[PDB]
Design a protein around this nucleic acid. Structure first.
Ligand SMILES: [Mg+2]
Ligand SMILES: [Mg+2]
Ligand SMILES: [Mg+2]
Ligand SMILES: [Mg+2]
Ligand SMILES: [Mg+2]
Ligand SMILES: [Mg+2]
Ligand SMILES: [Mg+2]
Ligand SMILES: [Mg+2]
Ligand SMILES: [Mg+2]
Ligand SMILES: [Mg+2]
Ligand SMILES: [Mg+2]
Lengths: 107, 127, 125, 198, 188
RNA sequence: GAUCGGGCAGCAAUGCAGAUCAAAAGGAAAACUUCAAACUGGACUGAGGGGCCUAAGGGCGAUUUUGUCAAAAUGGCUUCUA
RNA sequence: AUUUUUGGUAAGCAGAACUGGCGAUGAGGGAUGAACCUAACGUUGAGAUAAGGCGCCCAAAUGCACGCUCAUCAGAUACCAC
RNA sequence: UAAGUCAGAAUCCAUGCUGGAAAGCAAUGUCUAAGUGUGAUGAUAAACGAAAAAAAAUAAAAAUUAAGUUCGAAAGGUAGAGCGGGGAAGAGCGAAAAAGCUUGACCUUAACUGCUAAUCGUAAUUCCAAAUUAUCAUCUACGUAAAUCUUUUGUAGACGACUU
């Protein structure tokens, strides 16, 4: 089969951790959500759950693996947002695409 | 969407002929509310409340190492429940198909899946 | 060539402002970077000419430093409203506004309607 | 930044700016290809930039010239050094970043077809007061003896001529399909959509 | 970030000068007396700032110091009508690395506060003046018979037209910002 | 009603239109400062394991529900990577 | 080291005064570096900062407005490199 | 001289010349036993439309201020249908890194119709494509071309290397 039918996740990029020239907090990743541009728009995702998927050797019959987290806060005035994961993201992850999902809908 | 249970879960029917989503407990959180609305003139919900969907679970005990499967009695009970549900559905789905059938594309629109377009902006979207 | 100028009494589009997407008129040129702005839907503003776009509507009736009121009248008599409303610009703009308000079903419809426009053209006769 | 491969047409682009942008894009995962490098612009007298590139030709490793710096005279590489300069290129991460960028002069085969893109902020017209001085890269690489300028021109012309073919066909047929869109059966559906908020 | 009411909605477009009146009196403070009150017009960004400007000038002009007097009041002045363009003259003294200078300057603006703000930016850029150094001697809203500067008189005509020769592309909101787009903009 | 000019007129003498200031009589409103009342979305945290206490309202510093988990699964070790 | 100081043409020289500091001291900023700027250190998470920054290397504005500048030797700032 | 133009150096860059293990590229000779052999497990700084070909000009125009576009987009099934999609051979064209475009046996699929979806129990990657390639195991083929050492030359040589 050609593709997956419906993908409901927004594409995010992993920019790096939250850092100063000589110092970095690896607790807080930075993401840029696709077509997300200003702080206003980023806010919209505030509680949202985000996934990090990667592949590897068979673990419980699945060749993939996951790390789950949430976007918490606007970082700087273009579209950039801190994410926290369960396990602080591995650093090679930096080049890569993460899945923003719309799961957190509340009243 | 049919009605909201006391447990808080949402009561749900993909018309099982059109969607394939037969009759469902769902969480408010896990869904997006569309402004497209179908009237259920056939509202039957009084039939169905939380206790309606139970299930019977195998015994996972410290002497079996939480290694569990269901007995024959259980296969049966669950089969029966399933047939029962199959029945109860048509009750609800039936006025539904009707109501839905009268809205031009609504059958297809229900049959279809919701994907994002690359160019989309879920944060400013109007549904 | 140079047909469209920034002049006392020009019809201008406010872009990049609190006022974006709104027409206005120009009563005075303050320095070379800023003009004085008015209209029915906008307070009397000073704006950097940078934020503004010339609309090719020149109202020769307008007078230097015209009071808000008299301007609004002259503007009304000119039909900035009707005239601009016919413009390819405003037509497109409104079309956008239309696309803005559409629900899941609206899209879906448009898609099936889009497929039909494609697969049906063979109807010669 | 998310499109699978961006291809930039460097023409009328300013070196350093196009540079920084492509650099960032690169760092963040965008795989780029830049084209028509020979067409990039630099602010200053062609003279001044020749003085500068000369000044660079002048630097070298003393005891052994064939170790370290190689002074590259093609526009492609001029740009490349430019970008490598703006990445942490000794870092494994920086390396990846680099590997993402490919650069050419003129518009080579795989890239005839794919849509060429522009970085708006990087345009000479956008960036530089009209009456201030500038150079095209290929002029510099001329002064420094990159021989292919003439060839590239010829080659470009060739490809321009293929363009006119594509386009013209594309226009003719695409008018014919717009005309038959105005016929009765479809005129109906057109109206349906317009009302639908075309 | 405290706005004076007569400043623009966009803080960007103008400096935070406001025009103040400050008035005070010799400290002894004798009751039934008819005190000499010293009053002055200062341009500052604060009440505090204004007080400073006040006292500086006052101790230069007269015997008084602060321990020797009391501040009666500080009252911001406002411009009449923000509907018209006016030509303002300003008379300055400022301090350049060599010496001190008296300048006369003109600006076409909607506010005397605007006249001043523009004056400061100009004086920084063209003259490398330091705000603290600048002393505004007298300020007049100019009658047309009285306007002397060429870049001022330059703008009097109704026939005034600027083509907009070059339009540098500037998206409307940030929501529209793209680094790289699929086609080239235009100027005009 | 009075001034003015970066108007149209008018050959001039003069008029039409402005803009600024503005009498008594009326209308209708914006920006700033201060001080208040109230709505909705997030992130981090849950130290302690009582029946005592009262301003009679409560306080004393997280509870509830549900899902998954037998397989090296989880935690760790050696080596390596960023 | 700031300020004040004597001999000396002068010195990253030789001497003195008050307060610090460096030695005995790490952290962020001055790319870099004992005595500068912020700031004084138990293990750890959040938030908002100082000094300094926000085109890329680099977290953060190719922000929004002003004035001035074209260098066939531009310019790019405390202690600092004349 | 500010735009704009000529002349113009033992200078600069080229031309010529020597290197050229640039972990660059091309053309060509022969060979690669047996199959467009299969199986299992894997890795690739990044698959889920990660969609998209005018050329040129920014003091142009009769006229259009933003890819702020356009196209695609239905069930990760089955049975029919068949708008439409993809393409053997051979014959055409195509060279800047020949990437492919045409025709075409045939292969396939959308509306519409019937079954099939539910008990994957209110979430836990939606594990499937494409281009590459590693390892282990195996079935068929037990062959073909060439090189090197043990020789040879002295146009070369410390030894390797090199000409023959
Ligand atoms: Mg483990
Ligand atoms: Mg002192
Ligand atoms: Mg000493
Ligand atoms: Mg001291
Ligand atoms: Mg001290
Ligand atoms: Mg010691
Ligand atoms: Mg210290
Ligand atoms: Mg912290
Ligand atoms: Mg800028
Ligand atoms: Mg010459
Ligand atoms: Mg020389």
């Amino acid at each position: 089969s050609p593709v997956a039918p419906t993908r409901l996740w927004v594409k995010a990029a992993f920019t790096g951790f939250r850092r100063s020239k000589h110092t970095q907090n690896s607790n807080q990743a930075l993401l840029k959500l696709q077509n997300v541009n200003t702080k206003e728009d980023v806010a919209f995702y505030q509680g949202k759950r985000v996934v990090y998927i990667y592949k590897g050797q068979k673990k419980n019959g699945s060749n993939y693996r996951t790390i789950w987290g949430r976007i918490g806060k606007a970082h700087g005035n273009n579209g950039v947002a801190v994410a926290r994961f369960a396990h602080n993201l591995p650093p090679q992850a930096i080049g890569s695409v993460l899945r923003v999902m719309l799961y957190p809908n509340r009243a | 969407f049919l009605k909201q249970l006391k447990s808080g879960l949402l009561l749900v029917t993909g018309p099982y002929k059109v969607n394939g989503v037969p009759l469902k407990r769902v969480n408010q959180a896990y869904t997006l509310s569309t402004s497209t609305k179908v009237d259920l003139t056939g509202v039957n919900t009084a039939k169905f409340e939380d206790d309606y969907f139970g299930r019977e679970k195998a015994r996972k005990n410290h002497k079996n190492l939480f290694k569990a499967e269901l007995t024959e009695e259980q296969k049966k009970k669950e089969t029966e429940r399933k047939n029962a549900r199959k029945q109860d559905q048509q009750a609800v789905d039936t006025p539904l198909l009707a109501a839905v059938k009268k809205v031009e594309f609504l059958k297809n629109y229900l049959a279809s899946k919701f994907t994002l377009n690359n160019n989309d902006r879920p944060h400013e979207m109007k549904f | 060539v140079f047909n469209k100028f920034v002049q006392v009494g020009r019809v201008v589009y406010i872009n990049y402002g609190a006022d974006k997407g709104k027409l206005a008129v120009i009563v005075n040129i303050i320095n070379q970077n800023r003009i004085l702005i008015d209209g029915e839907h906008i307070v009397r503003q000073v704006i950097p000419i940078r934020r503004v776009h010339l609309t090719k509507f020149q109202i020769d009736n307008v007078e230097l430093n015209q009071r808000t009121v008299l301007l609004k009248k002259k503007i009304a008599k000119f039909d900035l409203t009707k005239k601009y409303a016919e413009t390819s610009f405003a037509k497109k703009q409104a079309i956008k506004t239309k696309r803005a308000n559409l629900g899941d079903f609206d899209r879906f419809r448009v898609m099936v309607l889009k497929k039909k426009l494609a697969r049906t053209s063979a109807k010669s006769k | 930044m998310f499109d699978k491969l961006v291809v930039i047409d460097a023409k009328g682009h300013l070196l350093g700016r196009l540079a920084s942008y492509v650099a960032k894009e690169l760092l963040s995962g965008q795989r780029i290809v830049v084209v028509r490098t020979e067409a990039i612009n630099i602010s200053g007298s062609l003279f001044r930039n020749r003085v500068k590139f000369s000044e660079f030709l002048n630097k070298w490793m003393n005891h052994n010239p064939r170790r370290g710096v190689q002074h590259f005279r093609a526009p492609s590489r001029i740009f490349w050094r430019a970008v490598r300069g703006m990445l942490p290129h000794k870092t494994p991460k920086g390396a990846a970043a680099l590997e993402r960028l490919k650069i050419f002069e003129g518009i080579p085969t795989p890239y005839d077809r794919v849509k060429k893109q522009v970085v708006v902020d990087a345009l000479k017209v956008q960036r530089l007061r009209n009456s201030r001085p500038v150079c095209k890269l290929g002029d510099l690489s001329a002064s420094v003896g990159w021989g292919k300028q003439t060839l590239i021109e010829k080659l470009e012309e060739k490809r321009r001529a293929r363009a006119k073919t594509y386009h013209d066909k594309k226009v003719k047929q695409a008018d014919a399909r717009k005309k038959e869109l105005a016929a009765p059966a479809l005129k109906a559906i057109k109206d349906k959509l317009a009302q639908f908020g075309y | 970030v405290r706005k004076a009411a007569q400043e623009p909605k966009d803080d960007t477009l103008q400096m935070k000068v406001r025009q103040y009146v400050v008035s005070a009196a010799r400290l002894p403070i004798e009751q039934g007396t008819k005190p000499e009150i010293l009053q002055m017009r200062v341009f500052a960004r604060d009440e505090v700032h204004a007080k400073t400007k006040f006292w500086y000038n006052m101790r230069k002009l007269n015997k008084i110091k602060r321990s020797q007097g009391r501040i009666l009041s500080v009252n911001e002045i406002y411009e009449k009508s923000l509907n018209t363009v006016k030509t303002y003259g300003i008379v300055l003294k400022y301090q350049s690395r060599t010496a001190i200078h008296n300048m006369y300057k003109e600006y076409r603006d909607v506010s005397l506060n605007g006249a001043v703000s523009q004056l400061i930016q100009d004086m920084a850029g063209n003259h490398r003046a330091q705000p603290d150094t600048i002393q505004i001697i007298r300020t007049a809203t100019l009658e047309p018979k009285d306007i002397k500067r060429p870049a001022t008189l330059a703008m009097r005509n109704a026939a005034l037209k600027f083509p907009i020769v070059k339009t540098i592309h500037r998206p409307s909101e940030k929501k529209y910002r793209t680094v790289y787009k699929a086609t080239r903009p235009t100027t005009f």
